[PDB]
Amino acid sequence: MPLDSILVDNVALQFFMDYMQQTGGQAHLFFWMTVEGYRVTAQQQLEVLLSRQRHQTNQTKGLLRAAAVGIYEQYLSEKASPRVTVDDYLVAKLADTLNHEDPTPEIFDDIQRKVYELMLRDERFYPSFRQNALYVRMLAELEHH
């Protein structure tokens, strides 16, 4: 069962999360999931502010900014626990954008793609997860169909 599907099935995802915790990748996966949540929230909350011209937008904007900043500080920030590592200029670009511009849903998308790539084919994530007992156990929930 492939990573594309693992990440989006909450039964199967648990096994992968466990594996990542054990191998100390958990950070990447969390980052990814947070970004996935974040984007959708931004789209929901900012598409409301278009059809809300016919009124506390500030509340929304500040929340999204906070969320963005939180994501940065937890995961991409230099001074950060595990800290997902990717093309340093992408992170720097993101930081620049944050430091003088209202955030969009997509600010994270470039970094998120790289992180997904890492999770897919870095020998220490998915490819050795599929070589682990946890994978086998997960595929034990064919019994959940």
Residues that bind Cl ion (CB under 5 A): 14, 98, 106, 109-110
Q: Which of 77, 53, 73 is nearest to 65 (CA)?
A: 73
Give CA–CA dist 26/32, Å, rounded.
Answer: 10
- What residues contact residue 35 under an 8 Å CB cut-off, 6+ apart? 71, 108, 109, 111, 112, 115
Residue 120 CB, nearest distance to Cl ion (Å)? 20
Q: What token pair was written down for 4?
A: 């594309």
Residue number, 56 or 98, with CB nearest to Cl ion: 98
Residue number, 105 or 125, with CB nearest to Cl ion: 105
Residue number, 7 or 98, with CB nearest to Cl ion: 98
Q: Which of 66, 10, 67 is nearest to 35 (CA)?
A: 67
Residue number, 14 or 60, with CB nearest to Cl ion: 14
Residue 67 CB, nearest distance to Cl ion (Å)? 13
Residue 74 CB, nearest distance to Cl ion (Å)? 8
Residue 15 CB, nearest distance to Cl ion (Å)? 5
